Curated annotation (Swiss-Prot), chains A, B:
Disease note: Poirier-Bienvenu neurodevelopmental syndrome: An autosomal dominant neurodevelopmental disorder characterized by onset of seizures in infancy, developmental delay, impaired intellectual development, and poor or absent speech.
SMART domains: CK_II_beta
Protein name: Casein kinase II subunit beta
Organism: Homo sapiens
A Pfam family the protein falls into: CK_II_beta
Summary of subunit composition and partner proteins: Casein kinase II/CK2 is a tetramer composed of an alpha subunit, an alpha' subunit and two beta subunits. The beta subunit dimerization is mediated by zinc ions. Interacts with DYNLT2. Interacts with CD163. Also a component of a CK2-SPT16-SSRP1 complex composed of SSRP1, SUPT16H, CSNK2A1, CSNK2A2 and CSNK2B, the complex associating following UV irradiation. Interacts with MUSK; mediates phosphorylation of MUSK by CK2. Interacts with FGF1; this interaction is increased in the presence of FIBP, suggesting a possible cooperative interaction between CSNKB and FIBP in binding to FGF1.
Keywords of this entry: Acetylation, Disease variant, Epilepsy, Intellectual disability, Isopeptide bond, Metal-binding, Nucleus, Phosphoprotein, Ubl conjugation, Wnt signaling pathway, Zinc
UniProt main location, coarse: nucleus
Length: 183, 183
């Protein structure tokens, strides 16, 4: 009853993902080159798409491959108009959390990868007000590869939706000692 | 046979406090003016010091007063040599948490008040590497008044202990889109 993609996205720790269309995945032009990064590609793919498979312990490995593949597909997908739209809905809901920087007054953030290359760095969060990047406060997010979001995504969303760019901070930090402005 | 001060500091949410010496509290010169900011001062003070008191349910109010008074005493105490020493121990233990800013590579932080006036702002956390201020990630800390730490404390500690000042971040965030440094 439940689709693999629906299932995966609803797992704990996977709150930053949206659901990629089957349409997108089914167009091989979108998947160029992934078959060189993922073991068991053909099966990982069948799995993502709820197709029928081929009794090993092994199949656990296809699940891991399935997860990596979905991740890499995801980073490409959220650069498309549909992808952006779904993530924007998430953004509006604060799904990605809020900037911890006092003078950003709780600006909602977006997920981002420091690298497009898997295994380099876990997913981070970008604040468009201070335009810097933060480690997610919740540890359920510390094992999600940032390559499944990519370096470009936030910039891409604000380009398509300039109306969501916040204004510069009204105020900033002013260090004080015994009443005096120091430094 | 647990002291009031020991009890308070061990309460959940009070992890950023250290234990003020009785010696300090018993020198009235240290408490100048606090009697004008706190209701039920005399009793709040007796309570802090584990002396004895006398609708005797009211007393709940003396406990609230006692907590405010200790808080205000604390903000004066942590600017002294003994105070700083205790907070440094805490700092070294990461009791106050770590900077969420990716490129600060988990610099440990210090508590800080944006105002020395009670009721203005809840306690914040100061990172000495990026020299900006953050909201504590944990909500158990969102009802602690920053006036119990004050604006001066961090600056004061690094003045007494310059050897703890971190170096500037090696790196910083470099926005990229499809490989390109964008600007
Ligand atoms: Zn920010
Ligand atoms: Zn920092």
């Amino acid at each position: 009853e439940v689709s693999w993609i629906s299932w995966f996205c609803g797992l704990r720790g996977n709150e930053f993902f949206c659901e990629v269309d089957e349409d997108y995945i089914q167009d091989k032009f979108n998947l160029t080159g992934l078959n060189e990064q993922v073991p068991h590609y053909r099966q990982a793919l069948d799995m993502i798409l709820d197709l029928e498979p081929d009794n090993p312990n092994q199949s656990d490995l296809i699940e891991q491959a399935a997860e990596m593949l979905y991740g890499l597909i995801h980073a490409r997908y959220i650069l498309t108009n549909r992808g952006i739209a779904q993530m924007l809905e998430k953004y509006q809901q604060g799904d990605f959390g809020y900037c911890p920087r006092v003078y950003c007054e709780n600006q909602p953030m977006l997920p981002i990868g420091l690298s497009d290359i898997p295994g380099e760095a876990m997913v981070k969060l970008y604040c468009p007000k201070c335009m810097d990047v933060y480690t997610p406060k919740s540890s359920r997010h510390h094992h999600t590869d940032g390559a499944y979001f990519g370096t470009g995504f936030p910039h891409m969303l604000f380009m398509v939706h300039p109306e969501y760019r916040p204004k510069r901070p009204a105020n900033q930090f002013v260090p004080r000692l015994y009443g005096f402005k120091i430094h």
